[PDB]
From a paper:
Most insects, including human-targeting mosquitoes, detect odors through odorant-activated ion channel complexes consisting of a divergent odorant-binding subunit (OR) and a conserved co-receptor subunit (Orco). As a basis for understanding how odorants activate these heteromeric receptors, we report here cryo-EM structures of two different heteromeric odorant receptor complexes containing ORs from disease-vector mosquitos Aedes aegypti or Anopheles gambiae. We determined the structure of a heteromeric complex formed by ORs from these species in complex with a Apocrypta bakeri fig wasp Orco that is amenable to structural determination. We find that these complexes form asymmetric tetramers containing 1 OR and 3 Orco subunits, where activation of the sole OR subunit upon ligand binding suffices to open the ion conduction pathway.
We first focused on the conserved OR10 receptor family, which detects indole and derivatives in various mosquito species. The cryo-EM structure of an OR/Orco complex has a 1:3 subunit stoichiometry. Aside from the different extracellular loops, the OR10 and Orco subunits have very similar fold, despite having only 15.1% sequence identity. Importantly, the residues in Orco that are in direct contact with AaOR10 in our structure exhibit 97% sequence identity and 100% sequence similarity to those in Ae. aegypti Orco, providing a structural explanation to the ability of Orcos to substitute for each other. The cryo-EM dataset of the unbound AaOR10/Orco complex contained two distinct subsets of particles. The existence of active and inactive states in the unbound dataset suggests that even in the absence of odorant, AaOR10/Orco is an equilibrium mixture, consistent with the well-characterized high baseline activity of insect odorant receptors in the absence of odorant ligands. The strength and shape of this unmodeled density suggest that it represents a lipid molecule co-purified with the heteromeric complex. The long tail of this density, in turn, is wedged into the groove between the S3-S6 and extends into the transmembrane space, helping stabilize the inactive conformation by preventing helix S6 from moving towards helix S3. Thus, both the presumptive lipid and the phenyl ring of Phe136 appear to stabilize the inactive conformation of AaOR10/Orco complex by holding S6 in place.
Author numbering:
A (entry chain D): 1 to 375
B (entry chain A), C (entry chain B), D (entry chain C): 4 to 159, 168 to 243, 313 to 474
The structure:
C-alpha cells in the first residue's frame, strides 16, 4: 500500500493540491484560495457587463473572465468530489507498485519513460503557466494609462483615480498565483492519468504477447489461470478509463464549451485590430486555447488508440497451439478490445484528434470567410 | 388498461384521451360514443383558430418581420395539428405496440430483478410525465403573462392592435368587452390543448424508450449471476437449469428488440415531420434573434420559442441516446463477468450475445437520421452557425 | 431469355432494347442486325438534337438567366446520353451480372421458401418497372402541357420566340406549319427516348438490388427452421442433414454476395457519373429557385426540375438503403432463433454468420460514396443550405 | 540491394538517390563519399533558388493578385524542400521499414502463390514508378512550354518583365543573353529536381502499400485451399499439416501488419505535413480560379496547379483506400470457403481471423486523419464549396 505522494506520476499534482488543501488536507488555505478568486471573477464579469461599447475591451477582458471562471469551476468540482480523486490516485499508486515489480525489461523501460514524460509535462505546464501569468500581470505597466491586468467593476468606485488603482493592482497580482494554481493542475492531472492508462494498456499488451513463456503446455490449469489474469487486467483497465472518463468528462465539457465560445470572438476580433500590438495578444490567446485543447484531445486519442491496439496484441499471441477453450477466450478478448476506451466530453463526444481537427477546420473556414466578407 | 405496458402507461393514456387525442381503445363501450364526439369538437376548434391565424397572416404579409413572426407561430401551432391527425391514421401500429408486453417471459430465479426494474420503470415514467406536464403549464402561464405585460401596438404612426395572446383575425370587435373576453378564453384553451396534445404524444414515445432501457438494465443485472449459476463439472439437472436460464435471457433480449422495433415503426415518421417543421422554425428564429436589441418583450419571446423548440428536440435525443448507451452497456456487462469459468454452453452464449451487442439499438426518423444527443448537438451547431452567418452579413 | 435473372427481368430487357439501349444479346440472331441499325439511328437523332441545343446555348450566353436555364436543360439531357454510351462499353460486365443466378443452390427442405421469395421478387420488379414507366410518362406529358400553356416570348422589347418544348436552334423556320409540327414531333420523340433510356438503366440497377434483398429475406426465413432441424443428441443421419442445411445456407449467402459485388462494380461507375452531373444540376437549380416570385410557369418548371433530379437520386438511395438494412437484418435474424438448443456445429455456424453480417452489403459510387438515404439526406441538406446562402447574399 | 523489399524497390531507390535524396545505405562505400557532396549541392541550389523566389515575393506584395500567385508557387515548391529535409531526419525508420521483409515465412504448399503474388507486386511497383515519372516529365514540359508561349509583361501601364519560368529576383540582368540563358537552365534544373524529389518519396510510400496489398491477396488466395486441406477423422499427420498451414497463415498476416505499422509511422508524419501545405495551397488556388475569364494562359496555369495538387492527394488516397479494402476483403475471403466441412481447429482459426479483420488496416496522417478516397472527397468538397462561396460573395 503506497501513498498518493509517493507515486512519481501523481505526486507533483497531488502535492500542489495538498498545498492549497483541496484533496488531501482541510486546513484554512482552501478558503483563502477560493473566496478571493471567486470574488475577483465576479467583479471581472461585472466589468464585462459594464464595458461593452468597445468590442476590443470586451474581448480582452472576457478572455480572462472565462479563464478564471473555468479555474473556479474546476476547483469547486475538485473540492466537491475529493474522495473520488483521492481513491483514483490511490488506485493509480497501487497499480504502479504492482507493475514496477514485473520482471521484464520492456515493461520496466516503458513505465520509466511514461513516468518521466508525465512528470516533465506536469512541471512544464506549471512553469509555462507561471511565466505567462507573470507576463500578463506585468503587461499593463508598459501600457500605462492606468490599466489593470484584468477586469474589475465595483459599483460606485473610481478604481483608476486614487491609490485605489494601486491597491487593486496589487491584490490582482497577488490573487493571480492561487488562480493558476487551481487551473493548470487539472490539465496536468488529466495528462498524467491518461499516461498511466497507456502504461497499463501496454503492460497488458506485452503480457498478452508473452503469457505462455515459462508455462508447460501439458498442464492446462496454468494456461487457464494466466488467461484469467489477462482478462481481469483488461477489466481493470476498462474500469480505470471509465472513472477517469466520468470526471474529466464533465469538467472538459464545460471547458470546451467556454473555449469555443471565446474562440469564435477571438477569430472575429483577429481582423479588426489596427493597434499592431494587440494582434500579437490575440494570436497568443489563440495559441494557448488551441494548445490546451490539443493536449486534452491528444491524450484522450492515445488512450483510445492503445485500447484498440490491445486487439492486435491479443491476436499476435501464441494462440495457434493452445487448446480450443483458450482460443475462444482470446477470441472474446479480441472482440471486446475492438471497442475503443473513449474519454467522452460531457458523455456526448468522444475526445479524439478527429474532433480537434474538426474544430481546427471550422476555425479556419470561419476566419477565411470572415476575412473575405470584411473586405 | 389491465395487462402490461398499458396499465403502466395508463395515466399517460388518460391524459392523452382527456385532451382530445382519440385513443378509442381502453375504456368501457359506454364512453365510446361521447368521447369520440368530444375529440372531434376539439379538433374542429383547433383548426378553426388555426385558420383564423392563417387568415391573419395573409393581410399581415406586406412587411417581412411580422411575416416571420406569424410563420413561427404558425409552425409552432402546426406541430399539435400534425400530431393529432397523425395518431389516428397510424393508431393500429400504436395499439400493436402497447400490447407487445402483455405476455412476457419468466424464470423462477430472475423474478426479483424483473419486479424491481419494472417498478423503477413505472416510477421514472410517472416522473417524466409530471415533469413535462409542469413544463407545458409553465409555458402557457408565461405566454399569458408576457402577452399581458407587453404593449399591444403595431407599427405603421401608432395603431393599437387588440391585446391578444395570439395575433388572429376575428369577425368580432375584439376590442370591447365580449369579444376580448371570448378571444382570451378561446386562445387560452387553444394553447393548453395544443401543447398538451404534442407533449403527450412525445411523452408516450419517451416512456416506451424508458421501459426498454429498464428492461436492458434488468438483463445486465441478471447477466451477472447467470454465469455463477452456470459455473460449477455440472450434473444433468444443473445443465437443464443453465439451459433454461440461457433461454430466458435470450428470449427476453429478443422481446426487448421487438419492442424497440415496434416503437421505431410507430413513431418513426412522426420524428421526421417534427424535425422537418423544426428546421424551418429554427431558421426563422435565427433571423428573429438577429433583430434582438435588449428589449424584454421581444427577447423574451424569441428565447421562449428557441427554448421550447430545442426542448422538444432535446427530449427525443435524450431518450434515444439512453437506449443506444444501454445496449452498448449490455455488451460491456456481458464481458465483465466470470464467463471464463462457466460451462462451454454458457461461454458460447456469452460469445453470441457479445457479437449481437456490437451495434446499439436506436430509433431513426424514417431512416433519415437517428435520435441521439449527437443529433441535438448538430441541430444546435447548425442554428448557431446560421445565426453567425446572418449577423456577419448584416 | 430462359435462365434465371434474365427470365425474371425479361420485360425490363425488352423495354431497354426497344428504347434504343443496344443490348444485342437476348433474341434470335435474325433480329441481331435490324435492331442494331435502329439503335444507331436513335443515338444519332439524340446527339443531333443535343447538338442543336448546345449551339442554341452559344448565342444565348449574353445573359445569365437564359444561360443558367440552358445549362440545366443541357445537363438534364446529358444524363441519357451518358447512360446510353456507358452501357455498350461496359456490356461485358452487365451480361456477367445477368448470368450470375443461372445455376443456384437447392435443398429439398428450403425449396418452398425459395420459390415463394423468387416469385415475390419477380412481382416487386414488375411493380417497380410499371411505377417508373408511369412516372416517366407523367413527366413527358407535364413537360408538353406546360410548354403549351406558357407564353413564348423573350426579354430583350417583346420578341416572339418559337413555341417549342425544348429551346433549340433549327435551320428550319420553326415558326410556320411544317417546321413547327416537325420540331414538336421531334422534341416529343427526344424527350420520350431520353427519359426511357435513363430510367430503364436505373430500373435495371434497382431490380438487381430487389432480387438481392428478396434472396436475403429467404435466407432469414429458412434460418429460423434450420436450427430447429439441428436441435434434437443427434444420430449420424441427423448430423448429415444439419451439415447439408448449413452448406445450403452458407453457399446461398455467398451467391448473394457475388451478385451484390457484380451489381456494385457496374452501376458503381454509373452512379459516380450520375451524381457528378446531378451536383452541378442542383447548384444551378438552387440559383434558379432564388428567382421565383410566385409565377406559375417559372415556378412549375423549377420545381419540376428539382423533383426529377431528387427523384432519381432518391430511387437509387431507397434501394441501396434497402440492401444495407436487409444484410443487417440478416444478422438480427441469425441471432433470434433457438440456437441454445442446437448442436455445437449449428452454434458455430451461427457465430460465423453473425461475424460476417457485422458489415452491411452496400453499393458505392466507385468507392467515393455509398448509395443510402444518408446520401440523399446530405444532398438535400447541401442544396437547401446553398439556397439559403444565395438568398442571404443576394 | 540484395534483400527483400529493397531488391524489389531498387529502381525506386536508385531514382531517389540520383535526384539528390540522400539515402546513403545501398551501395558500396566507394560511392558513399562523392554522392553525399552531390546531395548537399542540390539542396543548396534548391534553397538558393527558393530564397531567390521568396525575396521577389517581398517586393511583389504591394498588389494582392501577384501576392497570391507568388504564395501559390512558394507552397508548390515548399513541398519538395520539406520532403527532402524530412527524409534524412527520419532515415532510421525508413531503413527499418525497407528491411522488414528480409526473412519471410515459408510453407511447401503455399510457395507457388507466394512467388506469383511477389512477382505481381514487383510488376505493379514498376508500373507505378514509370507512370509517376512520366507525369512529372509531362508537368515540367508543360511548365516550360506555357512559360514560352505566354506574354511576359507586368501591369503598373505596360512593363517588360524577364521571360522566366518561375518569377524570381536575380542579381543579374536576367534579360540579355547570358543572364537569361543561365536563369532558364537553372530554373529548368530546379523544376526537374523539385518534382522528382517530392514524387519519388510519394512513389516509395505507394510502393510499400502495393506490396502490402499483394501480400493480403496472396493470403486470401491460399486461405481458400487451406480449409480444404483441413476438411477430410484427420490422422495425426494430417492434423500436424493443418496446424502448420494455420501457423503459416497467421504468421504471414502478422508480418503484413508489422509492415503496415512501420509505413504508417514514417509516412504518416510525412502526409500530415503534406496535407497541411496542400490545404493553404488549395485555398489560394480557389481564390485564383475566381478570377478566370477564359484566357488560355491564366486558366491553363490555374488548372495545372489544381491538377497537380489534387493528383498528389489522390495518389495517397488511392493507395490507402486499396489497403483498407484489401483487409476487409481478407475478412470476406475468410468467410467464403468450405469451413463448415472442416475440423474444430480450422473453424476456430476462421473465427479468429474473421474477428481480427473487423477493423481494416489503414495509414493515418499521424492519427489526425486517414488516407482514403474519403479524404480526397472531403478535400474536393471543401475546395469546391469555398470556390462557390467566393464567386457568390464577389
Amino acid at each position: 500500500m503506497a501513498s498518493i505522494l509517493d507515486c512519481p506520476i501523481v505526486s507533483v499534482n497531488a502535492r500542489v493540491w495538498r498545498f492549497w488543501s483541496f484533496v488531501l488536507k482541510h486546513d484554512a488555505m482552501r478558503y483563502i484560495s477560493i473566496i478571493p478568486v471567486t470574488v475577483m471573477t465576479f467583479f471581472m464579469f461585472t466589468d464585462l457587463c459594464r464595458s461593452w461599447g468597445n468590442i476590443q475591451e470586451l474581448i480582452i477582458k472576457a478572455y480572462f473572465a472565462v479563464l478564471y471562471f473555468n479555474a473556479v469551476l474546476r476547483t469547486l468540482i475538485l473540492v466537491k468530489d475529493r474522495k473520488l480523486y483521492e481513491n483514483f490516485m490511490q488506485g493509480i499508486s497501487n497499480v504502479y507498485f504492482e507493475i514496477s515489480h514485473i520482471d521484464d525489461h520492456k515493461i520496466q523501460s516503458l513505465l520509466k519513460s511514461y513516468t518521466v514524460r508525465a512528470r516533465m509535462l506536469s512541471i512544464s505546464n506549471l512553469a509555462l503557466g507561471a511565466i505567462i501569468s507573470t507576463c500578463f500581470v506585468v503587461y499593463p505597466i508598459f501600457t500605462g494609462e492606468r490599466g489593470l491586468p484584468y477586469g474589475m467593476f465595483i459599483p460606485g468606485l473610481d478604481s483608476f483615480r486614487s491609490p485605489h488603482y494601486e491597491i487593486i493592482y496589487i491584490v490582482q497580482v497577488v490573487l493571480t498565483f492561487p488562480g493558476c494554481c487551481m487551473y493548470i493542475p487539472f490539465t496536468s492531472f488529466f495528462a498524467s492519468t491518461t499516461l498511466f492508462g497507456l502504461v497499463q494498456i501496454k503492460t497488458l499488451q506485452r503480457q498478452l504477447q508473452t503469457f505462455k513463456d515459462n508455462i508447460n503446455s501439458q498442464d492446462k490449469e496454468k494456461v487457464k489461470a494466466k488467461v484469467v489474469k489477462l482478462i481481469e487486467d483488461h477489466k481493470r483497465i476498462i474500469t480505470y478509463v471509465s472513472e477517469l472518463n466520468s470526471l474529466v468528462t464533465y469538467i472538459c465539457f464545460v471547458e470546451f464549451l467556454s473555449f469555443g465560445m471565446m474562440l469564435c470572438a477571438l477569430l472575429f476580433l483577429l481582423n479588426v485590430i489596427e493597434n499592431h500590438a494587440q494582434i500579437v495578444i490575440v494570436a497568443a490567446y489563440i495559441f494557448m486555447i488551441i494548445s490546451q485543447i490539443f493536449a486534452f484531445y491528444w491524450h484522450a486519442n492515445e488512450v483510445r488508440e492503445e485500447s484498440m491496439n490491445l486487439a492486435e496484441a491479443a491476436y499476435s499471441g501464441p494462440w495457434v497451439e493452445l487448446d480450443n477453450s483458450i482460443k475462444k477466450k482470446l477470441l472474446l478478448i479480441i472482440l471486446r478490445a475492438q471497442q475503443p476506451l473513449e474519454i467522452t466530453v460531457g458523455n456526448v463526444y468522444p475526445m479524439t484528434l478527429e474532433m480537434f481537427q474538426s474544430l481546427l477546420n471550422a476555425s479556419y473556414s470561419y476566419f477565411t470567410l470572415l476575412r473575405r466578407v470584411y473586405n | 388498461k389491465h395487462q402490461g405496458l398499458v396499465a403502466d402507461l395508463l395515466p399517460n393514456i388518460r391524459v392523452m384521451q382527456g385532451v382530445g387525442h382519440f385513443m378509442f381503445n381502453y375504456y368501457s363501450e359506454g364512453k365510446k360514443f361521447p368521447h369520440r364526439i368530444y375529440c372531434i369538437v376539439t379538433l374542429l376548434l383547433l383548426l378553426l383558430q388555426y385558420g383564423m391565424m392563417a387568415v391573419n397572416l395573409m393581410m399581415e404579409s406586406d412587411d417581412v418581420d411580422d411575416l416571420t413572426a406569424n410563420t413561427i407561430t404558425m409552425l409552432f401551432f402546426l406541430h399539435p395539428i400534425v400530431k393529432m391527425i397523425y395518431f389516428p391514421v397510424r393508431s393500429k401500429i400504436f395499439y400493436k405496440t402497447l400490447a407487445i408486453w402483455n405476455n412476457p417471459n419468466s424464470h423462477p430465479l430472475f423474478a426479483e430483478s424483473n419486479a424491481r426494474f419494472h417498478a423503477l420503470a413505472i416510477t421514472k415514467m410517472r416522473r417524466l410525465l409530471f415533469c413535462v406536464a409542469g413544463a407545458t403549464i409553465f409555458s402557457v402561464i408565461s405566454w399569458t403573462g408576457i402577452t399581458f405585460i407587453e404593449d399591444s401596438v403595431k407599427r405603421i404612426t401608432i395603431i393599437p392592435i387588440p391585446r391578444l395572446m395570439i395575433r388572429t383575425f376575428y369577425p368580432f370587435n375584439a376590442m370591447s368587452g365580449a369579444g376580448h373576453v371570448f378571444a382570451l378564453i378561446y386562445q387560452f384553451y387553444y394553447l393548453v390543448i395544443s401543447m398538451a396534445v404534442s407533449n403527450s404524444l412525445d411523452v408516450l414515445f419517451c416512456s416506451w424508450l424508458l421501459f426498454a432501457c429498464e428492461q436492458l438494465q434488468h438483463l445486465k443485472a441478471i447477466m451477472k449471476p447467470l454465469m455463477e449459476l452456470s459455473a460449477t463439472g455440472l450434473t444433468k439437472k444443473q445443465e437443464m437449469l443453465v439451459r433454461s436460464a440461457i433461454k430466458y435471457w435470450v428470449e427476453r433480449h429478443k422481446h426487448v428488440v421487438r419492442l424497440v422495433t415496434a416503437v421505431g415503426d410507430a413513431y418513426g415518421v412522426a420524428l421526421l415531420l417534427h424535425m422537418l417543421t423544426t428546421t424551418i422554425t429554427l431558421t426563422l428564429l435565427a433571423y428573429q434573434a438577429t433583430k434582438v436589441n435588449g428589449v424584454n418583450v421581444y427577447a423574451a419571446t424569441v428565447i421562449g420559442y428557441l427554448l421550447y423548440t430545442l426542448g422538444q428536440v432535446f427530449l427525443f435525443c435524450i431518450f434515444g441516446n439512453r437506449l443506444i448507451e444501454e445496449s452498448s452497456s449490455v455488451m460491456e456487462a456481458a464481458y465483465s463477468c466470470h464467463w471464463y469459468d462457466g460451462s462451454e454452453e454458457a461461454k458460447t452464449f456469452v460469445q453470441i450475445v457479445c457479437q449481437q451487442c456490437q451495434k446499439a439499438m436506436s430509433i431513426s426518423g424514417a431512416k433519415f437520421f437517428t435520435v441521439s444527443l449527437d443529433l441535438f448537438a448538430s441541430v444546435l451547431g447548425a442554428v448557431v452557425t446560421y445565426f453567425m452567418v446572418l449577423v456577419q452579413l448584416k
